[PDB]
Amino acid sequence: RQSVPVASLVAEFLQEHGVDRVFGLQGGHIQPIWDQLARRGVRIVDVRDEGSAVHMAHAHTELTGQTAVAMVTAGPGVTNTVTAVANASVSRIPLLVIGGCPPIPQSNMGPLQDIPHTAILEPITRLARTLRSADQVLREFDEAWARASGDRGEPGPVYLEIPTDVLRRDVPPALQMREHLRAKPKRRPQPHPDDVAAVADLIRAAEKPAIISGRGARTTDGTDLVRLLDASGAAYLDTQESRGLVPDSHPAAVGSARSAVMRDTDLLITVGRQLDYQLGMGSPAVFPHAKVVRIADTASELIDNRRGEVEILAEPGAALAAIADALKDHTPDTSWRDELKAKHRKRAEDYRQALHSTENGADGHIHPNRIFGALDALDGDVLDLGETIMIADGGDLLSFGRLGITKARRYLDAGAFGCLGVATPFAIGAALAYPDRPVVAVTGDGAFGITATEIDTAVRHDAKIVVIVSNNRAWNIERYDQAENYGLVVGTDLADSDYAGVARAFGAHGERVTDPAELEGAIRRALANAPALVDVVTTQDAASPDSGKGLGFVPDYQALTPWNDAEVARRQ
Amino acid sequence: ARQSVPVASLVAEFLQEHGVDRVFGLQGGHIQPIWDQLARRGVRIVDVRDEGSAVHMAHAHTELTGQTAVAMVTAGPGVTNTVTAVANASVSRIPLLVIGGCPPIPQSNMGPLQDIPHTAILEPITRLARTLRSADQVLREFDEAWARASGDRGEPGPVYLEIPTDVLRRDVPPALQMREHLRAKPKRRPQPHPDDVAAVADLIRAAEKPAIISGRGARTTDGTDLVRLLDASGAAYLDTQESRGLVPDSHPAAVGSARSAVMRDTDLLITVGRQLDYQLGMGSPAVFPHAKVVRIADTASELIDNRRGEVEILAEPGAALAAIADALKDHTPDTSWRDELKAKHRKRAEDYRQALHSTENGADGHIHPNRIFGALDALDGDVLDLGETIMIADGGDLLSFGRLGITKARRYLDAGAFGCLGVATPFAIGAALAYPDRPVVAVTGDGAFGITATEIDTAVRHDAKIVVIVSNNRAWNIERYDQAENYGLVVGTDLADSDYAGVARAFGAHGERVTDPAELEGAIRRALANAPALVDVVTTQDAASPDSGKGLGFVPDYQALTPWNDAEVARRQE
Amino acid sequence: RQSVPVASLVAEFLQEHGVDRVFGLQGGHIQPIWDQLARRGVRIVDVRDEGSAVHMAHAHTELTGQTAVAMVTAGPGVTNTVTAVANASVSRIPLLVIGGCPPIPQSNMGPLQDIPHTAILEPITRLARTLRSADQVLREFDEAWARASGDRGEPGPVYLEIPTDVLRRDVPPALQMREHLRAKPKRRPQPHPDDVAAVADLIRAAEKPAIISGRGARTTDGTDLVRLLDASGAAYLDTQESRGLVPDSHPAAVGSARSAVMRDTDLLITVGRQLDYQLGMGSPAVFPHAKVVRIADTASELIDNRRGEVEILAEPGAALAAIADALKDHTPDTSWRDELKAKHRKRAEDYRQALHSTENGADGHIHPNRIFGALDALDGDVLDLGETIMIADGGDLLSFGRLGITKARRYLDAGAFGCLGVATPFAIGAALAYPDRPVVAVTGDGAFGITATEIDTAVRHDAKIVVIVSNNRAWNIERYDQAENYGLVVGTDLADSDYAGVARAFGAHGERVTDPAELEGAIRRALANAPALVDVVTTQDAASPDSGKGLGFVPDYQALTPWNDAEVARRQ
Numbered sequence A, C: 001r002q003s004v005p006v007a008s009l010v011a012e013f014l015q016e017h018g019v020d021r022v023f024g025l026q027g028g029h030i031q032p033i034w035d036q037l038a039r040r041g042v043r044i045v046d047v048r049d050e051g052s053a054v055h056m057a058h059a060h061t062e063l064t065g066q067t068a069v070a071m072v073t074a075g076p077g078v079t080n081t082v083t084a085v086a087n088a089s090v091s092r093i094p095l096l097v098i099g100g101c102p103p104i105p106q107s108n109m110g111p112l113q114d115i116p117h118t119a120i121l122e123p124i125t126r127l128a129r130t131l132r133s134a135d136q137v138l139r140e141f142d143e144a145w146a147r148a149s150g151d152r153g154e155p156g157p158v159y160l161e162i163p164t165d166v167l168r169r170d171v172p173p174a175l176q177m178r179e180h181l182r183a184k185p186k187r188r189p190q191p192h193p194d195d196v197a198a199v200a201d202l203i204r205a206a207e208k209p210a211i212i213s214g215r216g217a218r219t220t221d222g223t224d225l226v227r228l229l230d231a232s233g234a235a236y237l238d239t240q241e242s243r244g245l246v247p248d249s250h251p252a253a254v255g256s257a258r259s260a261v262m263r264d265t266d267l268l269i270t271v272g273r274q275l276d277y278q279l280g281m282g283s284p285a286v287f288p289h290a291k292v293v294r295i296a297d298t299a300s301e302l303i304d305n306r307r308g309e310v311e312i313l314a315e316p317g318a319a320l321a322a323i324a325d326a327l328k329d330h331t332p333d334t335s336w337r338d339e340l341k342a343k344h345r346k347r348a349e350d351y352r353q354a355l356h357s358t359e360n361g362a363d364g365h366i367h368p369n370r371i372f373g374a375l376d377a378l379d380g381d382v383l384d385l386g387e388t389i390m391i392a393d394g395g396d397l398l399s400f401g402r403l404g405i406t407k408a409r410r411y412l413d414a415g416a417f418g419c420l421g422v423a424t425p426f427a428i429g430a431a432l433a434y435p436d437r438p439v440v441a442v443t444g445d446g447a448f449g450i451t452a453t454e455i456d457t458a459v460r461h462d463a464k465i466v467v468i469v470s471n472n473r474a475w476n477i478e479r480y481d482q483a484e485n486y487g488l489v490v491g492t493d494l495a496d497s498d499y500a501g502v503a504r505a506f507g508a509h510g511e512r513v514t515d516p517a518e519l520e521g522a523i524r525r526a527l528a529n530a531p532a533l534v535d536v537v538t539t540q541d542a543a544s545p546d547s548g549k550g551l552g553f554v555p556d557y558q559a560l561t562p563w564n565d566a567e568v569a570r571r572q
Numbered sequence B: 001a002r003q004s005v006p007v008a009s010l011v012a013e014f015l016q017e018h019g020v021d022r023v024f025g026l027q028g029g030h031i032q033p034i035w036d037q038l039a040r041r042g043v044r045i046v047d048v049r050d051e052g053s054a055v056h057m058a059h060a061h062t063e064l065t066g067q068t069a070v071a072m073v074t075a076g077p078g079v080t081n082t083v084t085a086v087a088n089a090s091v092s093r094i095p096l097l098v099i100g101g102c103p104p105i106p107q108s109n110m111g112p113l114q115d116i117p118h119t120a121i122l123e124p125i126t127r128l129a130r131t132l133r134s135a136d137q138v139l140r141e142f143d144e145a146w147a148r149a150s151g152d153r154g155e156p157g158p159v160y161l162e163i164p165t166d167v168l169r170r171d172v173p174p175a176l177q178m179r180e181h182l183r184a185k186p187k188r189r190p191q192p193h194p195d196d197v198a199a200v201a202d203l204i205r206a207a208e209k210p211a212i213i214s215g216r217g218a219r220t221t222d223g224t225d226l227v228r229l230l231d232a233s234g235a236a237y238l239d240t241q242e243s244r245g246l247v248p249d250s251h252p253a254a255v256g257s258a259r260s261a262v263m264r265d266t267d268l269l270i271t272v273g274r275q276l277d278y279q280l281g282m283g284s285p286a287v288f289p290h291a292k293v294v295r296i297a298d299t300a301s302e303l304i305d306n307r308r309g310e311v312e313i314l315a316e317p318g319a320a321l322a323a324i325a326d327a328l329k330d331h332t333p334d335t336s337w338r339d340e341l342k343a344k345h346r347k348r349a350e351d352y353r354q355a356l357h358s359t360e361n362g363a364d365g366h367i368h369p370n371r372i373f374g375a376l377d378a379l380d381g382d383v384l385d386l387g388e389t390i391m392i393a394d395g396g397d398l399l400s401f402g403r404l405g406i407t408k409a410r411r412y413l414d415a416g417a418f419g420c421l422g423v424a425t426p427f428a429i430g431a432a433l434a435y436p437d438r439p440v441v442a443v444t445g446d447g448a449f450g451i452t453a454t455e456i457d458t459a460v461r462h463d464a465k466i467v468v469i470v471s472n473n474r475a476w477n478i479e480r481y482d483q484a485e486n487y488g489l490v491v492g493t494d495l496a497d498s499d500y501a502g503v504a505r506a507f508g509a510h511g512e513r514v515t516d517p518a519e520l521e522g523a524i525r526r527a528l529a530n531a532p533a534l535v536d537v538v539t540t541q542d543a544a545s546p547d548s549g550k551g552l553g554f555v556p557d558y559q560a561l562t563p564w565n566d567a568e569v570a571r572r573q574e
């Protein structure tokens, strides 16, 4: 080892920890790190807005399991990340944000961009620190890295900033410890056999077991989950954060029976999933017959809103496998699951076939479902949807996408946070992670306006993305709440913008579609010429399931009117 | 004769009664009940493409008009999209109100849609950040927050209020709806003490080289009491980016091209509503080696930072300036230093401005950005009146060129002490809607513009007559230059030759590209006749601004700029 | 100037700013400052509990107007101050707390006492900062000093901590600026004449004007207040934080007519006073006929709960004088004030005479009012109450003290915060500030147990205090709420402790009293042998006004039941 500046050690720490790319936007306060990353051969993915760099890192970690890294300058560079940090905090995604900050001698003196970055980010990070001791920077990086994984907290984003005088300070070789530089494996806490047995007993006693998966299950490959589904006879639901773990044809997979499963299950088993608003707070009002069991590698998916009759805090794969083993010699009663599955095959197949011929709305414009129809039609022709990373974003468009996107290798969207504008930055992170196939992002026009200029980033970095915009000239799920519940539509209209022209202005391939019969060709040409955008002139006359269920109205107790009605009855 | 009405109605009424005739924002369900009531009262709703831009619009509105402005945004990402623009308003000490959505009280901490700790995130960069849980007290909490935005119990700047949707829908009995909370209130007017006035006038009589440097608080005045004091004192005058336009260009004190000379030699620095932050070298003795210090302001945020006054006046600055002018009634100032600076300033500024019309292309064959400022100067008195124009600047090298190139504006806005890239378009929109009779002109770097470009759509939908001129140098170019000069490696600072005119046309604005500098005057003339409009100017990468040359990109240990930093290193080793 | 360590410059800053004493408790982290203060001849008043040192500083500043200083070590030394800091924050008293903290190299590494002091104190200070730049320490001290006065905030406590490696670092003489070392005068913002005139017009139109004073009025000597009372014909009330500004015999002084003044005034004028719970939130329910005017040098006494038809933000003395001037040629209608005053003379004189002969309670023990009787009886004999600093603390005892303490030069008590245990630390600060006369502190036994060991501090530092304890073997106002509103008395009894013996064990003079006829002699002997304690065996059968009005019960809208009943009527 030689005496080297902090900036060099930070670059080395990152590379040794497996970082081969940093998302970011250059400023002088971080230039010393930026320089060293480039001299080490770390790819720098420079963006148009720092928020998008954090979104890119989120997508990288969520897909790959490798903690990703954004780097931004002092002041507005850091404050531009707060939305993307909050989003990663809510979704419990490990990532590191490296911020610039002013030199120590000028503290509190009004130097350029001295705002309290750590104070702003502390409520939505696992750690937010200013590193004032050159000798201890390496250690602070390694500990923050562990905390992003969930050590001393739960998985999520961490923030570190180094005053520029500290960045430029030398660290003697004695203080450069191999144990802080080196990559570390994930923790693997194991289940206790008594908890495994107690869950197996609940499954044997249950007539209508159901498993709902989430983030922690999606860290596994799905094979132990399928083993437990096979041993238990349970129905299976996933969530936006856990798509793709169970084959569609599996006798447990009943994705179009969500209400039926929640209403009747006598044993809900959560697997790395929160019982947040997305699952009716786990309320007895939404699960009126369910006993509860909770399995996760973090108590963030064990203690919220409902407690387990058993709770297992362990690596989910090992827990699922141990319970499957313990159900040796059990013959599950699958008659409820099978009855749901028969109804699911009809409902899901009818729905998917209908996507190819959905009528135009009263305004003469394309129903957004035709986008999902056209993608389904191209599957096995010009793209393999089962190898494709699908992204969804927007309001009505996002809700239609939850039903319209059924074959994807992986799925990302606006998350529990409802973070509009993720579609383009997610698509870019996904595409650079998996360069062999186009990534397809389907987005509302409202959402797309937030991060549209990242089309520039996609072209400059050659990220093979296809963005498809539902251009309905509106924040349409909002326009509909205003009409239905208030009788006045105001400040929710947008214009008939040329998003293909926006894409072409930033060097991407672009095409506008007004005729639904043109969608397959337009998407074919977009796939062949990625990065590409398809601007689809869509109807305002089309209520998504979210629209119809009051999501826009914000009831007192639950996100949706039907669940809220059930909760009001439970209360009395 | 009051009746029982929901909180959402009272909030809309509170705002209209406090003089709010417009609200910038982006609709979500959590704020819809307020949004609805604002529209039924006839308050204009200016709906944007990104909530950060709504807060920048409110900032511009307040900074120009002095009327506290309002942004309204939904829970979760709607609130977190504001943080940059809130920080910017906090650093610049601009009163504004952000009204955020938030989940109903029953669902607190349960993982409802968008339950993040908005108030904890915003508390470090607001004067007040609160969740309002008592229907009966919402009016009161609004009135108090409004007063704290003005600087009561703190200093001027942004405040944040959020009302859980169940509270928004709750009725308030009429007896709890107090006129005193609904009604508009006047600004405070603390007055100077005559002993402090006398003491300042004594310092001015004893000084040979008095200099006044203005800031935010001065810019809240019309400039006429400032001119009275300049006249009575014989002081030299500098402004800052936040105080342009208070003193006529031809005034014998106005020596804007003599910044280093004034700071090096003044024996009496008088700050008027101005911080001695990095923009004035921390007020360091290293940068003001001969100055005694006097500070005048209506807030100690412009009295106590880095240097203390031999006298500090905490008062409405207009009254303080007038009182000191009166106290100098029989003083005959020695103006010979000011006069010698002014004579040299006249020539240096005139030569500089003339040379803007003919600046040569850089080695890459592209337009020098100074030609944009030349073209605007040439059109003055032809198709636009720069003295009635609101000018905005944003970017890196472009912004530094703009500080020399923009000399005749009625009002000036830019990226601020925060160095907040992307303000150009949202500022221009707020400015144009405040002052609808003439185009607003925003000159921006391509880097900065990419942050808020989609707000061109907002300008077209709301008919904001803006002209945006882009220095398209295919780069974050002040950064590219720091990389080359101090590190020998240029990486992740290049952008592309994007069609910003095409982006503007895609959103229904007028757009044209300029590659030939002789085409600039026409392109800007056509842009002014067809606003909202963008002019995409292919500019050179071979052009170092004064900020570029002075190390701004490098971030020295003690001062923002190398020359000032060198002076501070010398001061330390005495 | 020479190159000197930060610790020396801090000692010099304090002495130059007028600090001639520092209250505190030594630890290694602050020893370098402690050492330099002692070498400069600054008196070190070392205490038994760091909280008491902050209370002492509070009393010094509140009495003298000079900002006072406590100094405490890292970790538990700082955390022991939080109550006394909160108390000073609520009362808006300028003070500086200097905390120790660990050296910079060991940050976040679990060094001895690395807890987040600044994060803990930030919600209840005007400034809380860690000073990491030796060169800028002087400047940070001067700015924090200004912020304690109210600059950029409102008057109250500030916290500064210097890592011990920074304390030991030299500062070059060039960076030691006279302007940061030197003492600074208080600000004096002046009224605008239009606001003065508008207030004078409201006074001319009012039939029943009333002035209520507070903290900001008590920063003046009272003479401009009396000028305005004379020019306006207003009734006058003070509050616990504004006693002693208006002579008792003044025709406006109607201290026993509090409810009558609030009920009928048609013009309430606050003078440096909050309309907090102590004045019924300024509610129309408590002031049903009042227009409102607010005068103060801080908007902390202008904007809370009621807005002024006029609000003057100025030095209160100048504002009061300007309004008195503007009432040149006004003949005030004093008939309401005079009618209140005639009733006041009878009520107050009857009450004060009755203090000399209050009966023992049913349990055979002294009524606490006899303490106030005995003090009244000694006035003009062995002490001059009009030159005496009186302190009150406790529950029932505190409430009886508000009526029983009527002649004092100055009065301190538990404050709006209701901070039990202030009595002894306040008495010590007061006594060292004004060494020529004994200070008398009257306290409940509950309150006294919190800070009793500071009797040791009083003896070691020769603070001439007399503490008189109402020893009723109870948190008695709490015992009474439990009996009246819950029917069960539990965990509110104390024991028949020997507080005279406690005092004698720490080297003070002590005496126990069981016979009310012994009180005058015991208090005479205590005054002659200060520091001294008188342990008065008092009754549990004695409801104070606070007890009778529900203070213990915490109603929904107001601190007291009658005010709360009025608010409930106003709401409907």
Ligand SMILES: CC(C)(O)C(=O)SCCNC(=O)CCNC(=O)[C@H](O)C(C)(C)COP(=O)(O)OP(=O)(O)OC[C@H]1O[C@@H](n2cnc3c(N)ncnc32)[C@H](O)[C@@H]1OP(=O)(O)O
Residues within 6 Å of the ligand: A255, A256, A257, A258, A259, A260, A277, A278, A279, A347, A348, A349, A351, A352, A394, A395, A398, A399, A402, A403, A404, A406, A414, A415, A416, A417, A418, A419, A477, A545, A546, A551, A552, A553, A554, A559, A560, B027, B028, B029, B030, B074, B113
């Ligand atoms: C408040 C506001 C407007 O300002 C916002 O900020 S909103 C933020 C933007 N939007 C969001 O982030 C979305 C938030 N909401 C949601 O995530 C969802 O409403 C929910 C998770 C809370 C509830 O979703 P569901 O459990 O209903 O899941 P979906 O996948 O949406 O399924 C809807 C229905 O289609 C069914 N379905 C699913 N896949 C299908 C398929 N393939 N074929 C046919 N039907 C299918 C499904 O069973 C179900 O019908 P049913 O069983 O209730 O009768």
Ligand SMILES: CC(C)(O)C(=O)SCCNC(=O)CCNC(=O)[C@H](O)C(C)(C)COP(=O)(O)OP(=O)(O)OC[C@H]1O[C@@H](n2cnc3c(N)ncnc32)[C@H](O)[C@@H]1OP(=O)(O)O
Residues within 6 Å of the ligand: A026, A027, A028, A029, A073, A112, B256, B257, B258, B259, B260, B261, B278, B279, B280, B348, B349, B350, B352, B353, B395, B396, B399, B400, B403, B404, B405, B407, B415, B416, B417, B418, B419, B420, B478, B546, B547, B552, B553, B554, B555, B560, B561
């Ligand atoms: C760190 C990083 C890069 O990552 C960032 O985030 S930077 C953020 C974006 N940039 C900014 O926000 C800029 C921040 N810096 C500044 O604001 C300024 O550098 C400063 C306030 C610190 C210094 O500005 P000056 O006091 O030098 O003022 P300017 O108006 O720029 O004047 C520069 C020179 O032009 C002169 N000048 C002004 N008007 C003139 C005129 N009309 N004609 C000729 N010369 C003129 C002026 O006198 C002076 O020359 P001199 O006296 O020093 O020799």
Ligand SMILES: CC(C)(O)C(=O)SCCNC(=O)CCNC(=O)[C@H](O)C(C)(C)COP(=O)(O)OP(=O)(O)OC[C@H]1O[C@@H](n2cnc3c(N)ncnc32)[C@H](O)[C@@H]1OP(=O)(O)O
Residues within 6 Å of the ligand: C255, C256, C257, C258, C259, C260, C277, C278, C279, C347, C348, C349, C351, C352, C394, C395, C398, C399, C402, C403, C404, C406, C414, C415, C416, C417, C418, C419, C477, C545, C546, C551, C552, C553, C554, C559, C560
């Ligand atoms: C909640 C709990 C129990 O856990 C706690 O923590 S309590 C904390 C400990 N206690 C406190 O900090 C006290 C808090 N409360 C108070 O400060 C008071 O209740 C109050 C400020 C809110 C209200 O006080 P008042 O305005 O009633 O003032 P007092 O000086 O107490 O006067 C009481 C009465 O005696 C009268 N009075 C005053 N001086 C007199 C005199 N000299 N002679 C005769 N009567 C006199 C006075 O007029 C009034 O009677 P009326 O007009 O209402 O009929």
Ligand SMILES: Cc1ncc(Cc2csc(CCOP(=O)(O)OP(=O)(O)O)c2C)c(N)n1
Residues within 6 Å of the ligand: A393, A394, A395, A396, A397, A398, A418, A419, A420, A443, A444, A445, A446, A447, A448, A470, A472, A474, A475, A476, A477, A478, B026, B027, B028, B029, B074, B077, B078, B081
């Ligand atoms: C940053 C932010 N601001 C506001 C909102 C609130 C919202 C949730 S859904 C929606 C409408 C989205 O319109 P889009 O055109 O994308 O989709 P569509 O319904 O098909 O027309 C809004 C405004 C959220 N969640 N995030």
Ligand SMILES: Cc1ncc(Cc2csc(CCOP(=O)(O)OP(=O)(O)O)c2C)c(N)n1
Residues within 6 Å of the ligand: A025, A026, A027, A028, A073, A076, A077, A080, B394, B395, B396, B397, B398, B399, B419, B420, B421, B444, B445, B446, B447, B448, B449, B471, B473, B475, B476, B477, B478, B479
């Ligand atoms: C949100 C944010 N992120 C980064 C930065 C740091 C910066 C300051 S100046 C600059 C270059 C701006 O490039 P532009 O193209 O607008 O101008 P020009 O130099 O003429 O090419 C950067 C990146 C700031 N202040 N704010």
Ligand SMILES: Cc1ncc(Cc2csc(CCOP(=O)(O)OP(=O)(O)O)c2C)c(N)n1
Residues within 6 Å of the ligand: C393, C394, C395, C396, C397, C398, C418, C419, C420, C443, C444, C445, C446, C447, C448, C470, C472, C474, C475, C476, C477, C478
């Ligand atoms: C630190 C703290 N803990 C509890 C309380 C709550 C309280 C307010 S009054 C009171 C009883 C005081 O008993 P004392 O014996 O002093 O007075 P007396 O009624 O005459 O017997 C308590 C416990 C407060 N305010 N502060």
Ligand SMILES: [Mg+2]
Residues within 6 Å of the ligand: A444, A445, A446, A470, A471, A472, A473, A474, A475, A476
């Ligand atoms: Mg839309």
Ligand SMILES: [Mg+2]
Residues within 6 Å of the ligand: A051, A080, A083, B050, B052, B081
């Ligand atoms: Mg943003």
Ligand SMILES: [Mg+2]
Residues within 6 Å of the ligand: B445, B446, B447, B471, B472, B473, B474, B475, B476, B477
């Ligand atoms: Mg550029």
Ligand SMILES: [Mg+2]
Residues within 6 Å of the ligand: C444, C445, C446, C470, C471, C472, C473, C474, C475, C476
């Ligand atoms: Mg007691």
